[PDB]
Design a protein around this ligand. Structure first.
Ligand SMILES: C[Se@@+](CC[C@H](N)C(=O)O)C[C@H]1O[C@@H](n2cnc3c(N)ncnc32)[C@H](O)[C@@H]1O
Ligand code: SF4
Length: 340
């Protein structure tokens, strides 16, 4: 509030780049504990005698390295590609799908070689032109919540803004967006916020900004000319979810009244979890009310990795149909991009 790490690791090669040099100067000036690491994917000595201790301390650790995997992963249905600017998050959302993602790390990572990253992004744009290529920047992190430290997202926003056939988008649970308001986005960036019922936010989303904070930031970015959108996720069938989500869209409409919502977008994602979710989540959040009963769910099999549990077809349709009714009631002319 806003996030500042208690421990910072640096790859030695990171210091050769402008951002790495700038961060090293910043954190040494702040007197924060700094260590060295050979690879950002192999960080040693994070404090903690228990797994819970190491996990929580990792969430307060920043790692500064060089992106060496310049192949961009797909990020459908959100966008064509995931632009790799950062990985990990300081939040403690109980359901966070990044916890059980293959090769995920609990600590926060930022990449310094932005020239290489944007150059590769331009290559992908060139390969598909004159078709539009969309980039997701918050696929494996909360890029916005981290950005006050680096301004990497601001540079990405202004890079994409200068292109002809490139578009950027990202979604956040944080309100610390003041530095991005004067960015030359040029109408080519979709600034989104994750929203949910009061039940889900209060019980499952600690370490994030409040709903009022997210909406205050939503008004700022909209007022600064960004395309605005919302991601209703995870859509979770808690006790009283029907009324819970009704009141979400009602309150959302009240907090956005007066604004032009002609180009407003919605994305709907039902709660999913993997087979290793139960063991990991209960270890890290032992007092959680999160229901991970797999016998009530439908399993979707993985392609190259493992799959995940989602709600049964009839429950899923019921969620989709109900959410679509509320959006049409409170936001007519807003576009629902997908339900998954
Ligand atoms: C990984 Se989130 C990264 C972006 C940013 N840190 C943010 O939280 O908005 C991407 C979205 O997916 C949702 N989401 C997270 N976990 C799950 C899940 N297990 N099931 C279903 N949805 C899940 C989150 O609420 C986000 O709206
Ligand atoms: S804010 Fe997003 S990335 Fe961070 S823990 Fe919550 S769902 Fe995961």
């Amino acid at each position: 509030k806003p996030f500042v790490p208690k421990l910072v690791y640096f790859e030695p090669e990171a210091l050769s780049y402008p951002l790495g040099k700038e961060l090293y100067e910043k954190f040494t000036q702040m007197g924060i504990k700094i260590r060295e690491t050979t690879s950002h994917n192999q960080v040693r000595g994070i404090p903690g005698e228990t797994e819970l201790a190491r996990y929580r301390n990792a969430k307060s650790t920043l790692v500064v390295g060089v992106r060496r995997t310049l192949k961009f992963d797909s990020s459908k249905p959100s966008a064509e590609y995931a632009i790799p600017l950062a990985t990990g998050c300081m939040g403690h959302c109980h359901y966070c799908y990044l916890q059980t993602t293959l090769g995920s790390k609990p600590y926060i990572r930022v990449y310094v070689n932005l020239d290489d990253i944007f150059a590769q992004a331009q290559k992908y744009i060139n390969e598909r032109a004159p078709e539009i290529t969309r980039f997701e920047a918050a696929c494996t992190s909360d890029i916005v919540g981290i950005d006050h430290l680096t301004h990497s997202l601001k540079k990405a926003i202004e890079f994409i803004g200068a292109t002809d056939y490139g578009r950027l988008r990202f979604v956040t649970k944080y309100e610390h967006v003041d530095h991005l308001l004067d960015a030359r986005h040029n109408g080519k960036t979709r600034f989104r916020f994750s929203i949910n019922s009061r039940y889900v936010i209060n019980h499952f989303e600690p370490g994030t900004s409040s709903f009022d904070g997210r909406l205050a930031a939503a008004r700022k970015v909209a007022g600064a000319g960004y395309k605005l959108g919302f991601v209703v996720a995870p859509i979770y069938r808690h006790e009283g979810w029907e009324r819970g989500y009704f009141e979400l869209f009602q309150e959302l409409a009240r907090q956005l009244e007066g604004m032009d919502l002609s180009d407003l977008t919605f994305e709907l994602i039902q709660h999913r979890f993997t087979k290793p979710a139960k063991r990991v989540i209960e270890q890290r959040y032992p007092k959680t009310r999160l229901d991970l009963d797999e016998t009530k769910r439908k399993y979707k099999w993985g392609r190259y990795g493992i799959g995940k549990y989602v709600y049964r077809d009839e429950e899923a349709k019921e969620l989709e149909d109900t959410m679509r009714r509320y959006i049409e009631q409170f936001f007519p002319g807003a576009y629902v991009q997908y339900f998954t």
